[PDB]
Enzyme design. Structure first.
Site, PDB file in Angstrom:
ATOM      1  N   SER A 161      -3.166   1.983  -4.929  1.00  0.00           N
ATOM      2  CA  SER A 161      -2.783   0.713  -4.292  1.00  0.00           C
ATOM      3  C   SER A 161      -3.929  -0.360  -4.312  1.00  0.00           C
ATOM      4  CB  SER A 161      -2.353   0.969  -2.852  1.00  0.00           C
ATOM      5  OG  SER A 161      -3.419   1.491  -2.078  1.00  0.00           O
ATOM      6  N   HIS A 171       1.411   5.599  -1.783  1.00  0.00           N
ATOM      7  CA  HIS A 171       1.858   6.816  -1.089  1.00  0.00           C
ATOM      8  C   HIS A 171       3.171   7.409  -1.542  1.00  0.00           C
ATOM      9  CE1 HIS A 171      -0.839   7.586   2.255  1.00  0.00           C
ATOM     10  NE2 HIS A 171      -1.101   6.278   2.243  1.00  0.00           N
ATOM     11  N   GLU A 231      -5.621  10.153   0.186  1.00  0.00           N
ATOM     12  CA  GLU A 231      -6.035   8.757   0.120  1.00  0.00           C
ATOM     13  C   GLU A 231      -6.917   8.449  -1.072  1.00  0.00           C
ATOM     14  OE1 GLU A 231      -4.350   7.506   2.846  1.00  0.00           O
ATOM     15  OE2 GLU A 231      -4.539   5.536   1.879  1.00  0.00           O
ATOM     16  N   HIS A 275       0.826  -1.201   0.000  1.00  0.00           N
ATOM     17  CA  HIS A 275       0.000   0.000   0.000  1.00  0.00           C
ATOM     18  C   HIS A 275       0.851   1.238   0.000  1.00  0.00           C
ATOM     19  CE1 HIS A 275      -2.976   2.965   0.939  1.00  0.00           C
ATOM     20  NE2 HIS A 275      -2.328   3.311   2.055  1.00  0.00           N
TER      21      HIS A 275
END
Ligand SMILES: [Zn+2]
Ligand SMILES: [Zn+2]
Ligand SMILES: [Zn+2]
Ligand SMILES: [Zn+2]
Lengths: 328, 336, 342, 335
Positions: free
Chosen positions: A218, A159, A199, A154
């Site tokens: 992700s 990120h 996000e 993830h």
């Protein structure tokens, strides 16, 4: 009752408050690496198992195919350099130390190993120092396409690439800076704003809508869903996004789209300006400290630096000539 | 052709050209020349420095009882002279290093501990170096707020005098002043001015560094105090500089840069600055009239050098300044 | 690059007029068959032609017929302002009533009004014979100069005038120019026009029409009028806030390419979130204008500084650096103590 | 209590307090004391200045043949000395006034013409004044880039010497330097420093003004030149200041502000500045250590003073600076 916030990057050693047989033993081992870590330390390396690399490969391969058509330009540009310099490839899980060195050289962001999910305050506080609290563990091999925990996959695929962009790194830090010493109610609002931006955010790139959110870049299913005709896409407004209700079980029904990252950063600065705080904060990138601007004299101290920078630029303009220079 | 200069802090790995002076192999007048143990130790500590690459943690050196006894002699003697002869910024930093970086008579401090101290205070960091670097490489390092620091110690036979920059000289002379924001900026400013300059200009900046960072004096509440590293690390010269024997002149960057000097006996001429803030302003004026067809700006986020050689290069740096001013404008509304 | 003024005195050369509506050229003009009105028009135009920058604005002794026309126009519009005008207009209107001689029985003098605007936003007036060409009108706005007529519409048609008579200038334009943000916006359109192509002037003139002339603004969730043409027309002020027109969000690119007419009311209006936001939008539009230089106003000498080299930019940067020195001293001087000023 | 100070250029109508020094009515040593015609003319020209209110056109004076002959003597003699003794900025401006403001031996220039010249060059403007203003009012005027200027001329009997500031003094000594951007900023800076300051501080800035604007010297290409208005308007002292007789010291605002002086004979001590840019930087430092619980910022658009006495007052002014930087950033991208 007044909240303490770190004023030094080393003080992030105090911002470790977490939200809560073979696999469980391995998870205990990798968490111990995170617990032992103190600012300044090199990030320890993890020798990943063949099962763990196979789990990475499934996630990596599937999402890479979707990136060309669904990912924003900044993520694709960085992903490319990460494949070239930080060891991003289907048969290898990147090491956090290699990735942290990449980000440091690019935007000044650095990684910190974290045992698990941090409390919103500590997570946002870390971002104020351009520190990203990253997990080194990898999800179960049984459910590779779905993970309710922010695992290593993830973090590195969703990120990290965006943190290589100067503007996005400033935006991420700006949310972090706004949280310092804020109420729990404003931490809930900033955490919600983070959710619909860092996000699950979308952006307009040459008339097209692309994904920049870590939770989308992700997730194979959500990356497809967010650009489909099913969800409700709204214009990015920090006040609207901060009060928008959400859940973490199924795909997001509402997504917020920004005109550019530069414009979203301008919008966020306006939102952050109307946050109830009897002071403001400024990051010192030299010492990786927070300067609390709580008096006119504190503002003048910070203004001196800006004045010196303008002197540099004024001299540069006087030094610039019509002659085309040759640097060895 | 503009000479090559580092543009990233990692590129200081290429700035390792050393000066060969008062060498234990070449010079038979060196106190350690006939000492095979001292010479072996010196080879060992130099190899630690040669192996070093940016990003590595600074290696720790376990110092011998004889080496700690040498440190103790220098430390004790100089500490007694500091109250009366050292400037306020040195005394303030010295007290903080004593309590946070392991500065004490019975212990030689470790560079990793000192580098972490300096980082938190002024953004300066250390790198182990085998010996004295060429003027260009030394000044280039200062441009990134990096101080190239030795880990060896002077021979036990001559503790009160050492013409070479051992860890006693570095840690006692150079490091406390680097904990001051203004002095740390002055030292980076000399370094930024050197990047891609001519050899003639490097010699001038090296000479300016000698009368400021190495042998400078400052006016503190009507009194003249020492701030130079060569003075704060030498018992004999620290006494001499504030005596009525030498000729003290007002600090002028152009006068200091062209002033002749020697490194054998004590300095006959010293330059005194009104304040560090004023010396930095004087330096800015000197650096502005340096022959360079571009300017440079430090990026403290990535620890890189931005070459401002076009209007587009200047706009990209102006964008940051504009964002900083936005922060300050919101601060004034928050204080309101 | 077309010629543009670089000194405020050079506006003496920016006097090219648009004559299509004049009482002697348009058949459909109410004053066309009025030899007295046409003679008076010639007389007041001569005041404007004789004017040179720096001169005090000459005073006009208005006739009883002319004051009666003013009174009709003033009274009717004043009633509509409370409900339809934006806050900035209403605030300034009240101040002009008390300081510049704005009352139903008196036509205000441009010299009095210019002194008011100078003290408030640095804007100044200059008498103009009639409607100026888009280029010259915009070029003057760059110097914070508003080219203002002194004549008044014919007494037969007080509720409608297709030309910018003194009623239009003083009741429509002037109050909005007493606001610092709106004055900056007006000057910004002006500065963007300097040395621009004819095609770009046409775009900037149409942008002006759908902002300064017929622009609407959102004031505390409600839609108010700020356009000079709206605020000086009883009919058009009612129409713009009715359910009849198509109101669109303000976008400089959309507004600049939008077609329009000057016979009936506007079918389409553009609404801005705030004046501060409209100025930011205009700044972005102006940034993508084909120009090999930029311009900066020197408010000390009322000159245009052409920023066409890095040395030119660092000369302007020196001023900004001095301003920041002023602000740095202030922050060090400021204390927590509550001051007593005589 | 903070003393009252003007915050609008129109408020300079209230800054008209005159000093009474070398008065033709009171002083029997005045060259015009026994001259009833001169005394009547002086009364007349003072009345023109008293009638003046901000916004009015600057009145013109029709000068007599005797008055133009006095001007001619002063103008001619000094002009010969300028090439060798005057600083570059004065010479450059003098040549431009000769060609645009009617500066010539057979004509006394009109303040309306001179004010229009200065406005276009540095934003400075003039006001007619009856005589010498008190230090506070004169320095307050400078803060608005306003020079308070006399229209009368010295008695025809003593043309080479005048202890009072007549038209010859103002136009020849004070005006050419005000056409320089840097020098205009320096004069305004002294004026802005005074606003609402103590009497002790007004006395210091008044002395600083004397050793700079009135009797200052500057280093121009390794040579010492005169820029002071008391020097460029006096044949005798223009020669004296560059001779080996006086004591020339480096310019220091604190040293100059506390230096004692007299107005009878030529100055024994002069202060020399490296450049005008450097003297302005030195003055900024001096002004920063002036006991005032606020600062002041000029608004050139409305010709007003913004009192920066709170963080909100400072962020208001910072908004403008931020907009200026946006302009400059776009300029750099355009080139
Ligand atoms: Zn996440
Ligand atoms: Zn040294
Ligand atoms: Zn109009
Ligand atoms: Zn004088």
């Amino acid at each position: 009752m007044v909240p303490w916030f770190p004023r030094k990057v080393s003080e992030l050693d105090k911002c470790h408050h977490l939200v809560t047989q073979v696999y469980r033993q391995r998870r205990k081992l990798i968490a111990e690496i995170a617990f032992q870590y103190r600012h300044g330390d090199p990030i320890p390396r993890v020798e990943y198992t063949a099962e763990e690399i196979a789990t990475w490969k499934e996630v990596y391969t599937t999402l890479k195919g979707l990136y060309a058509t669904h990912a924003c330009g900044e993520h694709l540009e960085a992903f490319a350099l990460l494949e070239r310099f930080s060891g991003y490839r289907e048969d290898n899980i990147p090491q956090l130390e290699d990735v942290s060195r990449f980000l440091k050289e690019r935007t000044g962001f650095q990684l910190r190993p974290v045992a698990g999910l941090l409390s919103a305050r500590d997570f946002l506080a870390s971002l104020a120092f351009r520190v990203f609290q990253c997990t080194q563990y990898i999800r179960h091999a049984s459910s590779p396409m779905h993970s309710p925990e922010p695992d290593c996959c993830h973090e590195l695929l969703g990120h990290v690439p965006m943190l290589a962009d100067r503007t996005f790194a400033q935006f991420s830090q700006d949310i972090g800076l706004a949280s310092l010493g804020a109420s729990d109610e404003e931490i809930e609002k900033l955490s919600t704003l983070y959710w619909f931006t860092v996000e699950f955010g979308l952006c307009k790139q040459n008339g097209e809508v692309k994904a920049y959110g870590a939770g989308l870049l992700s997730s194979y299913g959500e990356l497809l869903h967010c650009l489909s005709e099913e969800p409700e896409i709204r214009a990015f407004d920090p006040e609207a996004a901060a009060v928008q209700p959400y859940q973490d079980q199924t795909y997001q029904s509402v997504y917020f789209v920004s005109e550019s990252f530069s414009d979203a950063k301008d919008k966020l600065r306006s939102y952050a300006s109307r946050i109830q705080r009897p002071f403001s904060v400024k990051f010192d990138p030299y010492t990786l400290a927070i300067d609390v601007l709580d008096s006119p004299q504190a503002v003048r101290r910070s203004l001196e630096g800006v004045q010196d920078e303008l002197d540099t630029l004024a001299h540069a303009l006087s030094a610039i000539g019509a002659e085309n220079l040759y640097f060895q």
